[PDB]
RNA sequence: GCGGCCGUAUUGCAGUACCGCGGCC
């Protein structure tokens, strides 16, 4: 099966996308693992890794320019901890159509200070009990979740919930 | 009823939430529809005539067909999307 | 200059300088 190589990067489309940002197109190569992204020389605002066969989000080089990650329709079930050191300015992560199962599996996303948009549509974790509430509570800076805004009133209600014994028990079990 | 469109590479979406700024509207449309295929462009204006609407242009007709079937009525910024094939071919796909 | 809340009108098939109006906090 494929490898993500420097040549694959050099031969892929590298273009101004519909929202005026610099995008690398890595869609549809059945890539099994992230590697060699250092060869992008931090040129891209956006990397499109849709329609591959990633099982984990990991192995990122330092890419301070990277602000949007498109990860549609992979098989991701784990995110490596500490990725904010590699991609600190990540503003949107689009994980539609993956295999993230539990609310604790989203723990690795907490240290991104600028992450304002998340999609977990068509992931098992998006129908876990307390999903939207938990996300409001755990990610204070998150603004758009599955393309519905987290309103201040939503975050207030979530924080009030997790101060109850019921909510406390929910948090206990997530850990 | 009006005449139905054969599948086209462009979908037309209306009933969009008009409070959303145009740049953010296009950004979020790009993200949610990127699951279906390569997107060639998005055309959205906020004039009186064209606000609340967007055209999403896919490279492949198959991608548009899945987008339409899958996202019909999806609550995007808390309004359900109304999606149809566009009534004409988009300029950017001209031969 | 920068926001929050509430309401109201347009449901419209396009290719963009920009994009409705009003009330409260
Ligand atoms: Cl066009």
């Amino acid at each position: 099966m494929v490898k993500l190589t420097p040549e694959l990067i050099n031969q892929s489309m590298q273009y101004i996308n519909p929202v005026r940002e610099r995008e690398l197109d890595l869609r549809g190569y059945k890539i099994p693992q992230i590697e060699n992204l250092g060869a992008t020389l931090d040129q891209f605002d956006t990397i499109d890794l849709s329609d591959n066969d990633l099982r984990k989000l990991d192995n990122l080089p330092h890419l301070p320019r990277l602000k949007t990650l498109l990860l549609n329709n992979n098989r991701i079930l784990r995110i490596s901890e500490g990725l904010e050191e590699a991609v600190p300015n990540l503003g949107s992560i689009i994980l539609t159509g993956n295999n993230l199962q539990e609310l604790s599996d989203l723990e690795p996303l907490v240290g991104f200070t600028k992450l304002e948009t998340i999609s977990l549509l068509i992931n098992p974790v998006s129908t876990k009990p307390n999903y939207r509430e938990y996300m409001a509570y755990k990610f204070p800076q998150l603004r758009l979740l599955d393309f519905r805004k987290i309103k201040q009133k939503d975050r207030q209600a979530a924080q009030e919930f997790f101060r109850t014994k019921q909510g406390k028990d929910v948090l206990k079990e997530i850990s | 009823g009006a005449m139905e469109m054969l599948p086209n590479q462009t979908i037309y979406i209306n009933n969009l939430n008009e409070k959303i700024k145009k740049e953010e509207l296009k950004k979020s449309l790009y993200a949610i529809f990127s699951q279906f295929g390569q997107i060639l462009d998005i055309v959205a204006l906020k004039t009186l005539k064209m606000r609340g609407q967007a055209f999403v242009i896919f490279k492949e007709i198959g991608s548009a067909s899945n987008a339409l079937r899958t996202m019909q009525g999806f609550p995007f910024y808390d309004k359900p999307m109304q999606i149809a094939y566009s009534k004409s071919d988009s300029d950017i796909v001209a031969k």
Side-chain angles (χ1 to χ4, degrees), chain A residues 20 149 151-153:
Chain A
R20 295 175 183 162
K149 289 185 190 188
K151 305 173 173 184
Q152 189 273 345
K153 64 184 69 181

Side-chain angles (χ1 to χ4, degrees), chain B residues 10 41-43 55 57 89-94:
Chain B
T10 295
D41 199 13
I42 305 174
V43 184
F55 295 74
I57 309 160
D89 290 342
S90 298
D91 290 349
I92 202 173
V93 318

Side-chain angles (χ1 to χ4, degrees), chain A residues 85-144:
Chain A
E85 185 178 356
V87 288
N89 297 312
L90 183 72
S92 171
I93 185 164
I94 307 300
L95 281 153
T96 306
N98 283 283
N99 199 23
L100 289 153
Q101 286 271 343
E102 303 289 340
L103 292 171
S104 64
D105 291 334
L106 307 176
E107 245 294 335
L109 298 177
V110 173
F112 287 102
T113 68
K114 290 179 185 178
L115 185 54
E116 289 187 337
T117 301
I118 292 170
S119 175
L120 287 163
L121 291 173
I122 321 302
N123 281 256
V125 66
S126 66
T127 45
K128 287 298 190 300
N130 316 110
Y131 166 68
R132 274 196 76 84
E133 294 190 303
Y134 181 75
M135 299 300 287
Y137 158 87
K138 243 296 191 198
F139 300 89
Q141 325 300 141
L142 184 59
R143 294 186 179 178
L144 188 67

Side-chain angles (χ1 to χ4, degrees), chain A residues 62-95:
Chain A
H62 195 209
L63 295 170
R65 193 180 189 112
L66 188 70
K67 295 177 284 289
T68 302
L69 250 189
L70 305 178
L71 294 166
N72 304 294
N73 306 317
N74 282 266
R75 292 184 309 172
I76 296 167
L77 69 159
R78 187 190 356 136
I79 303 168
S80 194
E81 285 276 355
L83 289 177
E84 72 273 14
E85 185 178 356
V87 288
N89 297 312
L90 183 72
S92 171
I93 185 164
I94 307 300
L95 281 153

Side-chain angles (χ1 to χ4, degrees), chain B residues 16-75:
Chain B
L16 297 170
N17 185 332
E18 293 174 16
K19 295 290 188 225
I20 310 308
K21 301 307 181 200
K22 183 175 68 176
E23 175 184 319
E24 167 167 9
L25 181 72
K26 292 177 81 167
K27 174 176 175 182
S28 287
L29 283 170
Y30 192 59
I32 200 171
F33 283 107
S34 64
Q35 59 183 294
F36 299 101
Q38 172 185 353
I39 294 166
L40 298 182
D41 199 13
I42 305 174
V43 184
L45 280 74
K46 292 194 76 180
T47 57
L48 172 60
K49 176 184 180 180
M50 292 310 302
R51 66 197 286 109
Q53 311 161 69
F55 295 74
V56 175
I57 309 160
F58 292 93
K59 167 165 206 14
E60 302 291 348
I61 300 181
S63 293
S65 288
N66 290 329
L68 190 153
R69 193 187 71 257
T70 296
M71 300 307 297
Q72 188 66 260
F74 181 95

